[PDB]
């Protein structure tokens, strides 16, 4: 049957903050079927510079995903806040969205 | 060029501490060329529920990917330590590997 994405934010590692851009990472897992659509947004405005994996199939037959947002490492630091936003048919209005931030 | 990996650890979100196995991520990133082997170790043993994305193509020309590896939450919360482990031609040794505990 249909599964329901669970969505988890993860930060960038510290060992990454000795770069000039760091990664944020929106994981989409246990999702059925394939089809799924995932973007990110800061301050209510599209954040473009991301690029996410194709869904890798799991051992119970679901799928999972990574999608990982480079920004400049002074807008992390400086407490900005970004969202991963997901489409999938298995999610109550075939939508959520998680935020990622310093500051929470 | 080649391009040396990057490997970072992960901890598991602490939105997923509700679930009874929880996920470690290893990330690597800014590697060229795509060929890569990744795997995991726990107090020195090979751990074997993983799976890996394939390599991505990045804006720079490089690759990179994930690897997560699924473990009983039991265990991460009894402090054992987890390891991601890269083979890659542009590393020192063609060789890494990243620590993650609690």
């Known amino acids: ?37 995932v973007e990110w947004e800061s301050n209510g405005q599209p954040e473009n510079n991301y690029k996410t994996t194709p869904p890798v199939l799991d051992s119970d037959g679901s799928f999972f995903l990574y999608s990982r947002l480079t920004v400049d490492k002074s807008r992390w630091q400086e407490g900005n806040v970004f969202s991963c936003s997901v489409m999938h048919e298995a999610l109550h209005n075939h939508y959520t969205q998680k935020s990622l931030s310093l500051s929470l």
């Open 1 to 37: 049957q249909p599964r329901e994405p669970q969505v988890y934010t993860l930060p960038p590692s510290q060992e990454e903050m000795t770069k000039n851009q760091v990664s944020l990472t929106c994981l989409v897992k246990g999702f059925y079927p394939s089809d799924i659509a």
